[PDB]
Amino acid sequence: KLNFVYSELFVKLIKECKKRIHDQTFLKN
Amino acid sequence: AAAFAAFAGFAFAAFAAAG
Amino acid sequence: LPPMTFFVEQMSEGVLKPEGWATMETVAGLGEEVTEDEGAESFNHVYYRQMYELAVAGDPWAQREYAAMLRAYDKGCESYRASYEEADVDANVEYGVESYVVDPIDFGPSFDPEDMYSHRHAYAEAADAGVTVIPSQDYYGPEHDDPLNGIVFQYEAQPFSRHGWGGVPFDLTVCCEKDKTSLCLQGETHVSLVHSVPPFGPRHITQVTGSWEVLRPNIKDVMYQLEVDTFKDGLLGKSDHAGCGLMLARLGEGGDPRKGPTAVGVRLQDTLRVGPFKLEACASKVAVQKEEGWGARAFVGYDWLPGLGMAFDFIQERTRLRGYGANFTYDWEALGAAFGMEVDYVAASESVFVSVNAFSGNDYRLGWLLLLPAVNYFKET
Amino acid sequence: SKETNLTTKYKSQFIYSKRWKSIFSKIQPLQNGTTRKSYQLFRNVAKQI
Numbered sequence: 256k257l258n259f260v261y262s263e264l265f266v267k268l269i270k271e272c273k274k275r276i277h278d279q280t281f282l283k284n
Numbered sequence: 285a286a287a288f289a290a291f292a293g294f295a296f297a298a299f300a301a302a303g
Numbered sequence: 304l305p306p307m308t309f310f311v312e313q314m315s316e317g318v319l320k321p322e323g324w325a326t327m328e329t330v331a332g333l334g335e336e337v338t339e340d341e342g343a344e345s346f347n348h349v350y351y352r353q354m355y356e357l358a359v360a361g362d363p364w365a366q367r368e369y370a371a372m373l374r375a376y377d378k379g380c381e382s383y384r385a386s387y388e389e390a391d392v393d394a395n396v397e398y399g400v401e402s403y404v405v406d407p408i409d410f411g412p413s414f415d416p417e418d419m420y421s422h423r424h425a426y427a428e429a430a431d432a433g434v435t436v437i438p439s440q441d442y443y444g445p446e447h448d449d450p451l452n453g454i455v456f457q458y459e460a461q462p463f464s465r466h467g468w469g470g471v472p473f474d475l476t477v478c479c480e481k482d483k484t485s486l487c488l489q490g491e492t493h494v495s496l497v498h499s500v501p502p503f504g505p506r507h508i509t510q511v512t513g514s515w516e517v518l519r520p521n522i523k524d525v526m527y528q529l530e531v532d533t534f535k536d537g538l539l540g541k542s543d544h545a546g547c548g549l550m551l552a553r554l555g556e557g558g559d560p561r562k563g564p565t566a567v568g569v570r571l572q573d574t575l576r577v578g579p580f581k582l583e584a585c586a587s588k589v590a591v592q593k594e595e596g597w598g599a600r601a602f603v604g605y606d607w608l609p610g611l612g613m614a615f616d617f618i619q620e621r622t623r624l625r626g627y628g629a630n631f632t633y634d635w636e637a638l639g640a641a642f643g644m645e646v647d648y649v650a651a652s653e654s655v656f657v658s659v660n661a662f663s664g665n666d667y668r669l670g671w672l673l674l675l676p677a678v679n680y681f682k683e684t
Numbered sequence: 685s686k687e688t689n690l691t692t693k694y695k696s697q698f699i700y701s702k703r704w705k706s707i708f709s710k711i712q713p714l715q716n717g718t719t720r721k722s723y724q725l726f727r728n729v730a731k732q733i
């Protein structure tokens with residue numbers, strides 16, 4: 256069963272974005 | 285110029301509301 | 304009711320940008336040092352709201368993220384409370400019981416004693432209240448009393464926010480001048496709404512402003528104005544900062560116009576880069592209750608000559624006197640001085656005005672340069 | 685100039701993975717409201733980024 260897959264992607268993608276692009280401490284460093 | 289301004293304003297408002 | 308030219312001038316202000324959200328520094332960095340950059344803060348807002356929603360849904364990772372955010376927020380709040388307590392203790396230590404006093408407002412030179420009435424404006428420092436109080440100075444005041452009449456309150460907030468994320472930016476300003484004879488009450492309010500963010504879509508913002516004016520003894524009539532403006536970026540390109548606004552003005556006695564003179568205006572604003580020209584344009588049309596006025600402002604820049612600034616204005620009355628104005632500005636550095644020139648040309652009156660400001664801080668060479676008026680000055684009897 | 689007699693320009697062929705295609709074909713995103721909402725959110729974010 257693959258009903259959940261998209262959800263497991265979304266909670267990943269934005270989270271990864273938070274780590275890689277819109278992180279203010281990383282930008283400061 | 286009044287008709288053109290009114291039409292442009294209406295079109296811009298409709299385009300902004302569509303998105 | 305003011306003429307349609309006033310409304311057309313008000314509407315054709317230029318390229319606008321509504322105010323965004325405000326962010327805490329402790330929570331955003333999770334206790335680490337951060338810098339300033341837009342797009343990474345509204346992203347944090349919407350991201351934390353979405354993660355709260357997902358955690359409520361049941362996703363464990365969202366729960367972990369929200370728990371970490373809550374821990375950071377609690378630590379920041381406790382740190383700020385401790386800092387406030389320490390600051391209060393230090394203030395008590397410095398001055399045992401004496402509250403801090405404020406410097407009085409300096410009005411200027413006059414034949415009356417300059418040090419007089421200074422005691423009246425020297426008050427104890429107020430607490431950390433949300434409102435901001437400013438005094439208003441009238442043109443002509445009483446000869447033997449202070450010339451400060453009235454007051455103005457300014458307030459800002461971002462309510463409907465959870466843990467410092469989200470909310471609705473809201474600004475308020477009220478000027479009140481009340482005496483035994485007259486009454487002047489001018490209120491203004493601004494509200495901001497955000498629909499989407501670059502990560503989750505386009506930049507869509509809506510600003511609603513409402514301003515009312517009351518002058519009781521002289522005018523005996525009140526005026527209301529309500530304007531709604533919508534801004535979106537990249538409508539016809541990568542970035543165009545498109546904006547459209549609608550304003551309604553009413554001069555009714557109270558509440559609804561009740562046959563009061565109404566006025567409806569609409570404005571459009573956009574900036575575009577074509578070749579070597581970055582052109583910003585704002586055009587508006589206003590109709591009062593039945594003449595209609597049109598206004599347009601444009602700012603034009605040339606990248607090969609960055610020192611020159613060019614502004615064009617076109618105003619058309621009801622059909623149909625068209626007034627065109629062109630303003631050019633330039634700057635340069637002379638010998639130990641800086642000279643800035645401005646040329647304004649109007650075709651309606653066929654007039655050209657040239658102004659040159661000069662500043663020198665090294666010596667008085669420019670003073671010896673200009674000596675014609677001394678000879679030009681004659682007693683003439 | 686021998687390619688003038690015989691010129692067979694074959695290109696633009698797009699190869700699609702069998703496993704990935706089957707996996708994403710077996711996914712039903714539109715028969716339920718919650719799945720549709722999650723798919724809409726992911727589609728918005730992916731198209732944006």
Ligand SMILES: CCCCCCCCCCCC
Pocket residue numbers: 297301498531533549
């Ligand atoms: C809630 C739906 C999003 C779009 C709302 C647009 C409201 C402003 C349009 C009318 C003023 C020009």
